[PDB]
DNA sequence: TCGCGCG
DNA sequence: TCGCGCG
């Protein structure tokens, strides 16, 4: 699905750029912050990423 | 302002109907839930309403 | 001590 | 144990 494909792009972004906050990932994938966050939290449910518990949270690959 | 006027309508709604959750107020004022909540929390800052700490919160007049 | 992803 | 108002 297109959501899966968007998630793949987010994973590629983190692989290429290292740990990142949502606002940065959103600017590069070119999606609004809420949409990026929807994907980041699904990716966390699916054990592909984790967040740092900072505010703002820092995201990276599992 | 129009925001003030919207807030007045929400207050009138609570005066006429008694304590209410946001979803109910939204349906009657005919505004989306987020907009109603924006107003309810401003009205709380301005000491005109309070919420019950229930989930969903129940709102009423101070 | 805004974290918010919420369907 | 969705509370979400967020500018
Ligand atoms: Mn908080
Ligand atoms: Mn909670």
Author numbering:
A (entry chain A), B (entry chain A): 2 to 63
What is the paper's account of this structure, in its own sentences?
Since these orthologs contain two left-handed deoxyribonucleic acid (Z-DNA) binding domains (ZBDs) instead of dsRBD of PKR, they were named as protein kinases containing ZBDs (PKZ). Therefore, PKZ is a functional ortholog of PKR but it recognizes Z-DNA instead of dsRNA. Zα domains commonly have a winged helix-turn-helix (wHTH) DNA binding motif and recognize Z-DNA in a conformation-specific manner. However, PKZ works as an innate immune sensor by recognizing poly-d(GC) as Z-DNA and turning off general translation machinery by phosphorylating eukaryotic translation initiation factor 2α (eIF2α).
To understand the difference in the B-to-Z transition rates of Zα domains in relation to their Z-DNA binding modes, we determined the crystal structure of caZαPKZ in complex with dsdT(dCdG)3 oligonucleotide at 1.7-Å resolution with R factor of 17.2% and Rfree of 22.6%. By the C2 symmetry operation, two caZαPKZ molecules bound to both sides of the Z-DNA in a head-to-tail orientation were generated. The overall structure of caZαPKZ is well conserved with three β strands and three α helices, like other members of the Zα family. In the complex structure, dsDNA molecules generated by the C2 symmetry operation adopt a canonical left-handed Z-DNA conformation. Interestingly, one manganese ion is coordinated with the backbone phosphate (P0), N7 of guanine 2 (G2) and four water molecules with an octahedral coordination geometry. The interaction between caZαPKZ and Z-DNA is mediated by five residues in the α3 core and four residues in the β-wing. Among them, Lys34, Asn38 and Arg39 in the α3 core form direct or water-mediated hydrogen bonds with backbone phosphates of Z-DNA, as observed in the hZαADAR1 structure. Tyr42, which is known as the most critical residue for Z-DNA binding by forming the CH−π stacking with the guanine 4 (G4), is conserved in structural and sequential aspects. Due to the shorter length and lack of positive charge, Ser35 does not form ionic interactions, but does have hydrogen bonding with the P3 phosphate.
